[PDB]
């Protein structure tokens, strides 16, 4: 897990030897793994590249971070408001700093991860201090231009 | 982080003995080729340096132990218990004020989510 | 050292942290009497520590009056500051962050969820200062005092209710003589009552209460504290009456009243002070004595069981595929494996690799179908010897001929050549 780098944000043009060919300049990528879905039978955008040394994986994570690969925000990492279609290049501290401009955050946010890879699932949950920050996130942040990924902010629970 | 904290404590001790706002022992040190990034207010350590300077100024008070001796806080446990009870009452009043502010914010959020947003009038 | 600047601010921060801990202890609600007594003892210990810190900080003002002339001088300044910065310009290779400058006194004055006790008060216990019969200040133990009174009176006609009725009197006639041996038991009963009063309220000022009791004993009890309408003025030491105040003032400095008797003011002053302290403890803790008397009456009126309850509170595949034949491996915790298809595969599985790492031998194809420990270590010794032999080791296998003689001595190894060329 230390020598392997988890890549997120892969489109349909990216393939299993294509990621190994793109990561060959960063370091000696020994193997590439792409988990296939059960309903569609294709990649879900997240994969893994197992290299030989941990320094090559660190250089690939520091070089290929927030890159625009196949029209997709590909990024390598070390393997009541709901935000969907978020970029995997952002972290919890980056999401807390991005959410601090609209309103005040009550605590540190959390992002959902896949049970197989564990880098990024695609959705996240963040809680605001009051309902005014949630309304400002649903008015402004729900549709704002993020890092090559259109996010969507919505209410997790609402009572009619 | 011990050397930076010691430098901040030395700057707070040297700046508290000044007779003016700008005529201090640290303003002339900035022009004497001494790098001090904690003097600018843009850094996060400046908020702690200001609190250290405030504590150094409060350590120079006449009831702080320079020319007088405290008798109520040092020789009366009942006065300390009354001060602790007053601090607990102030904390309870602050918690009640925060709960009232949260209730007012919830009432404003309930009133804003129930008003009609289709009756537009441009005058 | 900045004793007037840094040490005074540190003492003020410690006093503020102690006051914040006391306010957090007083703001929290209580549910039990023993936990409340432990919190009161911790608050009293924190108040004593804050008073000691204030007394230590209040004495650091002798050199401050001499150093204030040099500290407030605007002619000085950045010279000594630059000298202190050059003294603080040492090697910064100690890459270690210390966030416990102010967080450590905040954590020392706090408690945990498993045990509600502070870090200086971690060794404090309520069972070392109070007995089980007292109930952490709920009642008072009077069985030993009643046994001592029955042993001193030499009679079995005094029960616990009679002793409680005799001990309830404050200014009435005593049960025995004042010059008898009952004063030695009364002094012990007063010394126990003083400790019971000091244990029932640790947050109260015991020294101020003792000084007030001494002032009331000296200024009031020694000057006729019980006026009448021999009955006009009574003396506690001499145990005699007086006609008027002038006769009592003339007899207060008399020769039998000073030292010419066995109950004078010279020898029987401590017994009178102990009796006054016992009367003050009975007047201040009368509700606890009434609760102890009610508990004794409820224990006497109860039965044996009530007193005990109060004191206690395809079978064919089975053999075709290889099952029913089990194999065990010592390298794997004597884990017994099933039919051969699984047993042969276990050497590659996780558990066997774990078991082999215990000895320090890698998992390879050589160590397959080997289940015993000593066999594994012997085969590892063999393989080690073989491989280490068949490699090319230049250090011991090489022929150098140093230029020391330059025409002789070709038996030099690769290490002696460096030693000769050094
Ligand atoms: Zn085994």
UniProtKB/Swiss-Prot annotation, chain A:
Top-level taxon in the UniProt lineage: Eukaryota
Cellular component aspect of the GO annotation: nucleoplasm; nucleus; precatalytic spliceosome; spliceosomal complex; U12-type spliceosomal complex; U2 snRNP; U2-type precatalytic spliceosome; U2-type spliceosomal complex
Keyword Phosphoprotein recorded: yes
UniProtKB keywords: Acetylation, mRNA processing, mRNA splicing, Nucleus, Phosphoprotein, Repeat, RNA-binding, Spliceosome
Main location: nucleus
Compartment(s) where it occurs, according to its Swiss-Prot or TrEMBL record: Nucleus
GO molecular function: RNA binding; splicing factor binding
Modified residues (Phosphotyrosine): 46
RRM domain location: 3-79, 80-158
Keyword flag Cell membrane: no
Single biological process term from Gene Ontology: mRNA splicing, via spliceosome
Chain's role: Component of the 17S U2 SnRNP complex of the spliceosome, a large ribonucleoprotein complex that removes introns from transcribed pre-mRNAs. The 17S U2 SnRNP complex (1) directly participates in early spliceosome assembly and (2) mediates recognition of the intron branch site during pre-mRNA splicing by promoting the selection of the pre-mRNA branch-site adenosine, the nucleophile for the first step of splicing.
Disease as annotated in the protein's UniProt record: Acrofacial dysostosis 1, Nager type: A form of acrofacial dysostosis, a group of disorders which are characterized by malformation of the craniofacial skeleton and the limbs. The major facial features of AFD1 include downslanted palpebral fissures, midface retrusion, and micrognathia, the latter of which often requires the placement of a tracheostomy in early childhood. Limb defects typically involve the anterior (radial) elements of the upper limbs and manifest as small or absent thumbs, triphalangeal thumbs, radial hyoplasia or aplasia, and radioulnar synostosis.
Stated family: Belongs to the SF3B4 family.
Designated name of the protein: Splicing factor 3B subunit 4
Encoding gene (name): SF3B4
From Swiss-Prot, chain B:
Purpose of the protein: Component of the 17S U2 SnRNP complex of the spliceosome, a large ribonucleoprotein complex that removes introns from transcribed pre-mRNAs. The 17S U2 SnRNP complex (1) directly participates in early spliceosome assembly and (2) mediates recognition of the intron branch site during pre-mRNA splicing by promoting the selection of the pre-mRNA branch-site adenosine, the nucleophile for the first step of splicing.
Tissue expression per record: Ubiquitously expressed.
Subcellular location: Nucleus; Nucleus speckle
Domain notes: SURP motif 2 mediates direct binding to SF3A3.
Protein species of origin: Homo sapiens
Positions of SURP motif repeats: 7-49
UniProt site positions, description: Critical for binding to SF3A3: 10
Protein name in UniProt: Splicing factor 3A subunit 1
Organism taxonomic ancestry: Eukaryota, Metazoa, Chordata, Craniata, Vertebrata
Subunit structure of this chain's protein: Component of the 17S U2 SnRNP complex, a ribonucleoprotein complex that contains small nuclear RNA (snRNA) U2 and a number of specific proteins. Part of the SF3A subcomplex of the 17S U2 SnRNP complex which is composed of three subunits; SF3A3/SAP61, SF3A2/SAP62 and SF3A1/SAP114. SF3A associates with the splicing factor SF3B and a 12S RNA unit to form the mature 17S U2 small nuclear ribonucleoprotein complex (17S U2 snRNP). SF3A1 functions as a scaffold that interacts directly with both SF3A2 and SF3A3. Identified in the spliceosome 'E' complex, a precursor of the spliceosome 'A' complex.
From Swiss-Prot, chain C:
GO cellular component: catalytic step 2 spliceosome; nuclear speck; nucleoplasm; nucleus; spliceosomal complex; U2 snRNP; U2-type precatalytic spliceosome; U2-type spliceosomal complex
Ranges of compositional bias, category Basic and acidic residues: 294-305
Keywords carried by this UniProt record: Acetylation, Metal-binding, mRNA processing, mRNA splicing, Nucleus, Phosphoprotein, Spliceosome, Zinc, Zinc-finger
Subcellular location(s) of the protein: Nucleus speckle; Nucleus
Record's function text: Component of the 17S U2 SnRNP complex of the spliceosome, a large ribonucleoprotein complex that removes introns from transcribed pre-mRNAs. The 17S U2 SnRNP complex (1) directly participates in early spliceosome assembly and (2) mediates recognition of the intron branch site during pre-mRNA splicing by promoting the selection of the pre-mRNA branch-site adenosine, the nucleophile for the first step of splicing.
Subunit text: Component of the 17S U2 SnRNP complex, a ribonucleoprotein complex that contains small nuclear RNA (snRNA) U2 and a number of specific proteins. Part of the SF3A subcomplex of the 17S U2 SnRNP complex which is composed of three subunits; SF3A3/SAP61, SF3A2/SAP62 and SF3A1/SAP114. SF3A associates with the splicing factor SF3B and a 12S RNA unit to form the mature 17S U2 small nuclear ribonucleoprotein complex (17S U2 snRNP). Identified in the spliceosome 'E' complex, a precursor of the spliceosome 'A' complex. Identified in the spliceosome 'A' and 'B' complexes.
Name of this chain's protein: Splicing factor 3A subunit 3
Natural source organism: Homo sapiens (Human)
Top-level taxonomy: Eukaryota, Metazoa, Chordata, Craniata, Vertebrata
């Amino acid at each position: 897990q230390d020598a392997t780098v988890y890549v997120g944000g892969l489109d349909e043009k990216v393939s299993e030897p294509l990621l190994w060919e793109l990561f060959l300049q960063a370091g000696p990528v020994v193997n590439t793994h792409m988990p296939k879905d059960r309903v569609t039978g294709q990649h879900q955008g997240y994969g893994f590249v197992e290299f030989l040394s941990e320094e090559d994986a660190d250089y690939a994570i520091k070089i290929m971070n927030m890159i625009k690969l196949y029209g997709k925000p590909i990024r390598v990492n070390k393997a009541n408001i709901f935000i969907g279609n978020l970029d995997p290049e952002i972290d919890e501290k980056l999401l807390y700093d991005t959410f601090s401009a609209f309103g005040v955050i009550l605590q540190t946010p959390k992002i959902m991860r896949d049970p197989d890879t564990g880098n990024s699932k695609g959705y996240a949950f963040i809680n605001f201090a009051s309902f005014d920050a949630s309304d400002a996130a649903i008015e402004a942040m729900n549709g704002q231009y993020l890092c090559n990924r259109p996010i969507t902010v919505s209410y997790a629970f609402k009572k009619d | 982080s011990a050397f930076d904290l010691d430098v901040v404590k030395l700057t707070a001790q040297f700046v508290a003995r000044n007779g003016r706002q700008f005529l201090t022992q640290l303003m002339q040190k900035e022009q004497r080729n001494y790098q001090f990034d904690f003097l600018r207010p843009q850094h996060s350590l400046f908020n702690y340096f200001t609190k250290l300077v405030e504590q150094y100024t409060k350590i120079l008070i006449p009831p702080k132990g320079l020319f007088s001796k405290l008798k109520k806080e040092a020789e009366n446990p009942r006065e300390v218990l009354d001060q602790v009870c007053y601090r607990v009452e102030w904390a309870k009043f602050q918690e009640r004020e925060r709960k009232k502010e949260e209730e007012e914010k919830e009432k404003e959020r309930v009133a804003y989510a129930q008003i009609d947003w289709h009756d537009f009038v441009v005058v | 050292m900045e004793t007037i600047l840094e040490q005074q601010r540190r003492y003020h921060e410690e006093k503020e942290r102690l006051m914040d801990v006391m306010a957090k202890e007083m703001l929290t609600k209580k549910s039990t009497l023993r936990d409340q007594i432990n919190s009161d003892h911790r608050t009293r210990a924190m108040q004593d520590r804050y008073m000691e810190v204030s007394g230590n900080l209040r004495d650091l003002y002798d050199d401050k009056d001499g150093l204030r002339k040099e500290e407030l001088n605007a002619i000085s300044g950045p010279n000594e500051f630059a000298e202190f910065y050059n003294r603080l310009k040492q090697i910064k290779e100690f890459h270690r962050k210390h966030p416990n400058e102010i967080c450590v006194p905040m954590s020392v004055e706090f408690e945990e969820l498993l045990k509600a006790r502070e870090n200086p008060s971690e060794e404090a216990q309520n069972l070392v200062e109070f007995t089980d019969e007292e109930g952490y200040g709920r009642y008072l133990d009077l069985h030993d005092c009643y046994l001592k009174y029955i042993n001193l009176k030499a009679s079995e006609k005094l029960d616990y209710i009679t002793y409680l009725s005799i001990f309830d009197q404050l200014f009435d006639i005593p049960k025995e003589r004042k010059n008898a041996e009952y004063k030695r038991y009364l002094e012990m009963l007063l010394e126990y009552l003083q400790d019971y009063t000091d244990r029932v309220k640790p947050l109260q000022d015991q020294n101020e209460l003792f000084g007030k009791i001494q002032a009331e004993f000296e200024k009031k009890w020694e000057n006729g504290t019980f006026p009448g309408w021999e009955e006009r003025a009574q003396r506690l030491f001499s145990t005699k009456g007086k006609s008027l105040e002038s006769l009592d003032t003339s007899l207060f400095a008399k020769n039998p009243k000073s030292k010419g008797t066995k109950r004078d003011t010279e020898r029987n002053k401590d017994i009178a002070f102990l009796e006054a302290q016992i009367y003050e403890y009975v007047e201040i803790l009368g509700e606890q004595r009434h609760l102890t008397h009610e508990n004794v009456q409820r224990k006497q009126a109860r039965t044996g069981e009530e007193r005990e309850e109060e004191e206690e509170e395809p079978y064919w595949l089975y053999k075709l595929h290889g099952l029913n034949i089990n194999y065990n491996c010592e390298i794997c915790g004597n884990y017994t494996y099933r039919g051969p298809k699984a047993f042969q595969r276990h050497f590659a599985e996780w558990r066997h690799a774990h078991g082999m790492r215990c000895l320090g031998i890698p998992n390879t194809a050589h160590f397959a179908n080997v289940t015993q420990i000593e066999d594994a270590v012997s085969l590892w010794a063999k393989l080690k010897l073989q491989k280490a032999s068949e490699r090319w080791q230049p250090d011991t296998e090489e022929e150098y001929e140093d230029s020391s003689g330059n025409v002789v001595n070709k038996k030099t190894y690769e290490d002696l050549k460096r030693q000769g060329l050094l």
